[PDB]
Ligand binder design. Sequence first.
Ligand code: D7D
Length: 289
Amino acid sequence: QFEERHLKFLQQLGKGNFGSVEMCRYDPLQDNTGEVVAVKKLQHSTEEHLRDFEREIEILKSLQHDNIVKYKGVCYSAGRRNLKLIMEYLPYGSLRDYLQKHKERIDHIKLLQYTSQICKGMEYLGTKRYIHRDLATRNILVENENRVKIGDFGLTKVLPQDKEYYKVKEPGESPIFWYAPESLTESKFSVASDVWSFGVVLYELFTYIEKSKSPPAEFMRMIGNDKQGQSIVTHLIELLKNNGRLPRPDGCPDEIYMIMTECWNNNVNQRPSFRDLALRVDQIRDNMA
Ligand SMILES: CCCS(=O)(=O)N[C@H]1C[C@@H](N(C)c2ncnc3[nH]ccc23)C1
């Protein structure tokens, strides 16, 4: 149980259109010896966003896996109008920041160890028919030098039993440069669209988060200056339809780029499964040694 009066703000960790994550101390003894936790809260709270947040909390509470961030509890203290999700806090931070910082000691075998773990986490979500929808290094956390965890479930949805996709028509900001074509055009999300986004995560890893090499940076460079009265998402859809793809990262092995290109198939049914991805990654890693 978490009492609101004992949560002490330390630092901001990240932001989403309607959500924010903060590093807080939970200090019931009020002597600064309390545990440091990660607190997720709604930015501009609504009755609709609260119900969605309740679902997100039920999703994370239902997950227990070595490569999934741990649920600690909730903090209401003021009915259902100031709901907070309490999670474990990982001092090493996001994989996005860690990779950039430690790019000299992180080798390809290490990148593939993280890749394998994300795949394992994703296969586990699949057993529960959960679609993550927002896979990105920004949302992956570093437990230690040999372990990562999927750390946010803000866009995660459960598939209904009757279909293999979830349709989401909703404002505002979508991570369009991580989205599968059918997610851009039909707002259709599936295990297959999470595989496409995984391909983009694999790309982020092998660029070591070089700012000018990010998926928005590369797609924008490919779209070019000829924007002339058309939106960026219109240009992106056309580019993907015409088989335009993110380039092979500098020093990335052909076999690893092949996995990315397979994830980025226009036909959802031709994309690999997360079990096949783990097999292929684990073996490329074993061969590197
Ligand atoms: C709201 C949209 C998602 S976001 O803000 O783009 N990414 C999240 C911030 C968080 N993160 C870096 C964390 N850092 C350390 N410990 C942690 N536990 C739990 C989380 C967490 C992932």
